[PDB]
Amino acid sequence: VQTLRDRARKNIQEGAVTEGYSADRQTVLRLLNEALATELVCFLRYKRHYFMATGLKASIAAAEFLEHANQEMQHADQLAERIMQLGGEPDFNPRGLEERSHAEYVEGKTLKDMVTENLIAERIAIDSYREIITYLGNDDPTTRRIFEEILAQEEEHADDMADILDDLA
Amino acid sequence: QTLRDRARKNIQEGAVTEGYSADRQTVLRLLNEALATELVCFLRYKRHYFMATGLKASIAAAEFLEHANQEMQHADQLAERIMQLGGEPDFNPRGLEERSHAEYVEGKTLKDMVTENLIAERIAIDSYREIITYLGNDDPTTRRIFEEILAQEEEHADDMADILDDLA
Amino acid sequence: DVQTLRDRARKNIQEGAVTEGYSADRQTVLRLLNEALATELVCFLRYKRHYFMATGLKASIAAAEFLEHANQEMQHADQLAERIMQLGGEPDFNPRGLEERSHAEYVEGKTLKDMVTENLIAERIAIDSYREIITYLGNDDPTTRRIFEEILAQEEEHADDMADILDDLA
Amino acid sequence: DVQTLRDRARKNIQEGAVTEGYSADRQTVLRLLNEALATELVCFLRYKRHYFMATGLKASIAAAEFLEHANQEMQHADQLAERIMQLGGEPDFNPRGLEERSHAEYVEGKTLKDMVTENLIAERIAIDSYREIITYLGNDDPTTRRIFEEILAQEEEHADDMADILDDLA
Amino acid sequence: DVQTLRDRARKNIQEGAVTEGYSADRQTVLRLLNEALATELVCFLRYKRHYFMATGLKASIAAAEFLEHANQEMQHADQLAERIMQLGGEPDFNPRGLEERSHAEYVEGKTLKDMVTENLIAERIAIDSYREIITYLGNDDPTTRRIFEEILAQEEEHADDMADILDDL
Amino acid sequence: VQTLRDRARKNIQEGAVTEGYSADRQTVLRLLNEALATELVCFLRYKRHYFMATGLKASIAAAEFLEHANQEMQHADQLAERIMQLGGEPDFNPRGLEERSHAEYVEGKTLKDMVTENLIAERIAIDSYREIITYLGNDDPTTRRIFEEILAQEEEHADDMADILDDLA
Amino acid sequence: DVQTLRDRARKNIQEGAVTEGYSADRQTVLRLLNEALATELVCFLRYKRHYFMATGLKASIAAAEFLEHANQEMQHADQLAERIMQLGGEPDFNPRGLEERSHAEYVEGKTLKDMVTENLIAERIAIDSYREIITYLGNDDPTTRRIFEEILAQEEEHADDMADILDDLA
Amino acid sequence: QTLRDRARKNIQEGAVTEGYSADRQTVLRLLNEALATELVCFLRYKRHYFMATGLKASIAAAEFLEHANQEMQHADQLAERIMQLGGEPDFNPRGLEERSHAEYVEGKTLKDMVTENLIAERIAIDSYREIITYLGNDDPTTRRIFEEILAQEEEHADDMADILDDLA
Amino acid sequence: DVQTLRDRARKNIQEGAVTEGYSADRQTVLRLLNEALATELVCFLRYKRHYFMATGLKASIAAAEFLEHANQEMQHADQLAERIMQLGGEPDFNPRGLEERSHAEYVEGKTLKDMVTENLIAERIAIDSYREIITYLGNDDPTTRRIFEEILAQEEEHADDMADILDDLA
Amino acid sequence: QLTDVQTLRDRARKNIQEGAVTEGYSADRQTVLRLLNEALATELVCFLRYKRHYFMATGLKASIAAAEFLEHANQEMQHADQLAERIMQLGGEPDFNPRGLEERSHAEYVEGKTLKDMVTENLIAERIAIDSYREIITYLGNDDPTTRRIFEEILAQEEEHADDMADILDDL
Amino acid sequence: VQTLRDRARKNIQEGAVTEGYSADRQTVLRLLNEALATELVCFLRYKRHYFMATGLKASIAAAEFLEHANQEMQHADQLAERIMQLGGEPDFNPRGLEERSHAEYVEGKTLKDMVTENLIAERIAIDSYREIITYLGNDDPTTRRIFEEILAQEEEHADDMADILDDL
Amino acid sequence: VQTLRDRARKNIQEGAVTEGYSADRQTVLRLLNEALATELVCFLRYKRHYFMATGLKASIAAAEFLEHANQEMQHADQLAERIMQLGGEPDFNPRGLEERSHAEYVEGKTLKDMVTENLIAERIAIDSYREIITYLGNDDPTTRRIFEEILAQEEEHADDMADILDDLA
Ligand SMILES: [Fe+2]
Ligand SMILES: [Fe+2]
Ligand SMILES: [Fe+2]
Ligand SMILES: [Fe+2]
Ligand SMILES: [Fe+2]
Ligand SMILES: [Fe+2]
Ligand SMILES: [Fe+2]
Ligand SMILES: [Fe+2]
Ligand SMILES: [Fe+2]
Ligand SMILES: [Fe+2]
Ligand SMILES: [Fe+2]
Ligand SMILES: [Fe+2]
Ligand SMILES: [Fe+2]
Ligand SMILES: [Fe+2]
Ligand SMILES: [Fe+2]
Ligand SMILES: [Fe+2]
User: Fold this and answer.
1) Nearest residue of F to residue J115, measured between CA atoms
2) In Gene Ontology terms, what is one molecular function of this protein (chain J) (predicted)?
């Protein structure tokens, strides 16, 4: 009765983080920020390919590139919001961004170059977030669900890029 | 540089990465069986929607149509995943019922119609529960598709049972 | 009195939309409506199959048309079933024997040219079938005639849309 | 062949939509449009009466249909009045003698079966009435024919909807 | 009996909407579609001119009708060009000789009554032209017939709207 | 306690009509149906005028006529709904409709005729509904508010028609 | 002459909407608003319960009305709480003693006829309560009177809607 | 035919019928004084809206703008009625403040701005309460306008007082 | 093999969404669903009280969060009640004993800091309460688990939003 | 370091509270503010005049003018808002005081008796604003693009209002 | 000061054209009508290309053709509106339309033909409108802004067509 | 005549850039890319401040921080679109982003810190883009108008940030 309340009153400023939070909060925060860097890098890369993919066939890829780009930023916003709830700071610094990220920014010369670099990044993110989802287990459903939702989106991005690549050269 | 090499190996496989620990072949078979089930349930509900005329029946007819269209959304969801996992979705009407866990049943009465839909929903619920168990933690993206469909079928079952209890 | 218009309407009142003035062969029009319904359901399934399988840069353009066509087909299916019910029939959504009732076929195709060609064939079959139905109806059933005349126009668009693609292929 | 198309159009220019090529009997087409208009106004009033009076769980389903029908009837009224004006007539909205001009009646009914049955009778009267008008017009006035053909298709739907209800009652 | 339906469809398959059953004179139907297209383009330009020139209190009322008509005329143009393409023709948007191909003329007018009358004349020319076309088509080409029936009905509205204004002048 | 509920269960099928309803229900119902007849008549008269008022200036009146007609029907619906709540039957019968109504259906020959006839009807309704509002007093707020809302609308309809009539012949 | 209108406005300025001219008994009006607020909150909970429990074909129609009423009750609750704040009070949303404060009861009902009857009883209690409040206010507080007059008209509708259902039942 | 004769006499008076029992001339005077008040209050609120910058103040600034546009809606309501009753609405900025029950006051601080708006609302509340009493049952349509405006001013007064209590 | 899947579904058919394969303790899941329902109804009432009472410049920002939270609480209430029905229970909206059933309390608060603190305490009680329920369900009831996982995530947001405010206060 | 780019930033830190007004602002801030406020007064007067004409223009033909009057009135207020917004960005105070509003405004409030009066009075005001704002645009030159663009956008609207009113007046 | 108004009263019927209008109005009107013809011609050419560009790749260009066509008409409307404000008459006559225009109507046979002809026309318009913008200088801000808004639109159209042509 | 067409055909692949383009294309591209980097940096800084500014008062600034962030990205898109039209490549590389930009990414500790850094950045951009507008003169209206439109937005951002700082400093 009053013990339910006393548990909640202890360390109240910790907010979303309760007596029941069983995950390794600092390590989760580290992973959230690595993912955030990946999303920002993927956002900048896709935006680049979008502007550069001109032409008839390429304009189709350009549309997918832009759609992907803005989804990446949605993933970034989702992750930063969680970083804040779990007592961290989201790192939007462009300095060293690529070093924190699992993906690279690669301009590419051809369209096949562009698509391949995006496909490579998605497959890196897929396996990375699969590992994080496994690592979280049942200790942090709310964070686990963020990565599960991002994962499902990345799997779509991978298929969308691979579908294009098969038609190229 | 090995993360990049892991990703470059079998790049044409797309969403299916080295870390995909499920039996891709078996998941594809289950996805197509679900797809057939959803198309069959769509056709049955669409039949019942048109045939359920009257004062009281027209209320059931509305639910029939809502379910039919939800079934088609499930079909699209499953087919999309079949493609991401490197399969082919089988929309062939020939042998459609043999592939499906459900049946197409016209019914003579409205109680017939509701009962046949209720039976189909309960077949799907237990079938998809088993698939979700089979997937476990190997394919979250597919597991989440079936979990979302499952929740809908549970709604469809309650809606049909709620009606059936009021009938003759 | 003018009580004769009312007496006409009261006779066989449960027949609903079908009045004394309905001059068509109701049983046959219902047969044609159900054959048309089967054709649309098949065409819907074929187009959806092609939509999911047509991946790539060029093909994704075709896939969009395939999906647009698919849903137009189901709209036709709904129009026809609605009319079947108004004329006192039962619409047959049974997938068993669906192809046997249909003027069209379900064909997966291997290439994109295969998919486009098969859809073009189905449309040209439907166009000529529905022209024949429209003629059979004559002035006996304006409401049913108008459904097929409207579907016909959609099919001519689908045929032109698929042919326009096929000319650019291989 | 240019100045003769123009001279054709300049003659009786005040006739508006009604050109030399208008092969129908304008005076009679106007009579039929105004009878149709009275029928639609009457059917609107009857349905509105039934809408307000049909209370209860089961009745409210019919009442919803009564209202949809009522408002479709007024749409038909506007469509017909609009055409009357294009053909140089005057639409008669006068409530005095409205029923005598109409093919339908205003009938309150006591029961829901009464109300549904009376609406079903009126829809079936309109169907055959408008079928005859469509035949009378033939190819002489496509624009007026298409109005009646569009109204007819709606009346057939209204008849089916009322009959579908009556089967659950009688 | 199913392979012969398929054989009919394969013969001349590139002709698209035009099937073995198409019983109209395709070449002549196309000529009529192109004459109608010119009529609509001419009527569009004339109405647009009258719209801009019809200033004042009362005239602004006619000007609104002029603009609504102009844009309906272009919709008619679009319908006809779409049909020209389905039947294997070419829609002629060439401004050179546009008036010669058209049943109508471009006429500036000095007064508002000038403008309204010229528009009324054009609508009455189109009405009788399209009635003749609809008759020529008969039951041979429902899809084209329905286009002209739909355009005709709009032209009758335009004719009545212009005549209703002219009666006040 | 048990009397608040006992007052409400007694005569429960009388619905909105409670023990506290202090108005002369039968008379309120009579007035509601007379008002309903008036609105139906005014609806038909305005619709007649709307279709017949063609021309440059007349089309401006035609638009006001249509707005008025459709407001009249809203009033008809408002009143019929209230008749049902108070235990009556709304009379939509076209036979003898004018005999029940305070206003008349008048085709009019000229536009000034049409405007004048509408203005006369609005001023009849205004004075009728003011008397009903006074008659109701505080005995039936819900019904009173219906008439106060209709009255305000009729005052607008009257001002709109008089504004037109001042500019005429 | 402008300095006295301003001086009246400066006297007790923090009282806000409540001016020197407010002629009602602020304390008592606040009591009635809070009693009404409890009534609406209880009615919201009752209707919500009935909405979820009324399953079946015919019953689902009542469930739709139950939900609509439920949410209209909460709009009334908000309207009343908004006014309580303007008159310098505190709106009591405490679930403890909510029924003791409310003019209506929460009653689960066993049957649909039960549910409808209990809702119908509550509406008729509210009607007579709010009519009495409207009389008590007189011309002293138009802004509050208008809240109750608007709620009253809504309750008369809810009462009629429930009674219309009850007549068709058992 | 007597109802018709009543309506035909003085037909150009429009909404004002034989049964209009209010003092039309005096009602027009009050509508125009109220109109002036609303225009003045609109300008003052707009002034405060632009001048209330900062973290806290921007919250008040949003309220200032909302109030401002509501004031103009009232001006529109009042002018519409002035026309229906056969008058002329006075939008002249010369002497606008003399006709208005409220003042235009710039204020130096935010507390100044809030206090001045609160003073104006309480002036209008009591002014319109008096007008509603004067009308009684003689002019329902006009009475309802003032009753609707009055309720809005009470909200504005409560909203401003709610801000003032938190300030200084 | 088709008649055995079908026989499974006919056994206990009236149970609806609850199939032979449902491996949870339906009785207990329903108990927890109803305790959650009470918690959300109480949290809704508390937040609504705070919304209306939190006046002022800074406080109005909190008031907005209070209202957004309140309506999210009611959405949770509806989700939970819907599930109670599917599992064959009855959702308890009775205000009598509502607080005894709820894991949270209704607390008026005197200051804004009071209000924020009480809301924050409530969210943290809910967070840990629903985490325990998610554990209890395991893999036995995905559909119910997902409801709680979705609610949990919202409560974590509500906790962060209230704590973010409290850090700036007094 | 190497006070390079560090110079762009040191320019920005100086007088930071001056906000939009930077070291690069080459216009006479004091004078631009006077002009913005005169324009603001002009628009408020034009709004009140047009609103007056809207309510008084009853009749068949007049109601068409009444519609134009109302569209114009609300555009005038949009202009007033645009100008007041700029006054704040440049560190001024926008004067909404109705006392002396006309003395500050380039236009007049004129009731007019007839519709022809109303149309003419609005037409005169537009032509005053057109030439006033042309002069202001010229005075600004290239010193304040953001303020110039406000006046250029208002100017184009006033030219439309002028043409709209003249088109009506020709028929009277 | 009473002179501000007398300036505005002189030649009042000229409307937007005031004493301060320093441009050569007759010449501005000539340029506006030449631009109008250019837009009308470009509109017809684009529509022709839209209907004729069938196929997979071509349908992409066809969509751009239609967007451009309708933008061309928006420009035509902008220019005609300005002709009226400045006291001219807009010439929509199809006879001699091409002679008045800086562009041509060219059907083209291939898609490369169509795209090239559009690109050529856009570059003609760009340099024409740059010259007009220069001729206007500061004498007519309102007309100058119309051409600058169109110019930027034409630069987009040129880039869009060149982007397509590079792939052929 | 035939020379307008020949002028347009020369260097046709240059697209928007015609013979009449009198600006230094190479330099305009350099300036556009410096602005592009500035906007990307300002976007990241504002997003960081948005997530970190929690509390009652701080949430007001956070809302503005977010509105600014998204306006900055709109500016980035405008600038990149023009870079492509003038035949350049837009540089979205996070590597060296700050070195190319007139602005910096600065986390700040306090809200006063965040607001001040945003205010400084806007004032740098304001004066930088004013200079670019002068450099363009009348040689490139389309680009000048882009910067003139961005400038007006930056002036708003500066006023909005300064309005906040006055309440803090
Ligand atoms: Fe991705
Ligand atoms: Fe289902
Ligand atoms: Fe098709
Ligand atoms: Fe009808
Ligand atoms: Fe009907
Ligand atoms: Fe046409
Ligand atoms: Fe036309
Ligand atoms: Fe009226
Ligand atoms: Fe209620
Ligand atoms: Fe106020
Ligand atoms: Fe909750
Ligand atoms: Fe919560
Ligand atoms: Fe203006
Ligand atoms: Fe162009
Ligand atoms: Fe920027
Ligand atoms: Fe900025």
Assistant:
1) F167
2) iron ion binding
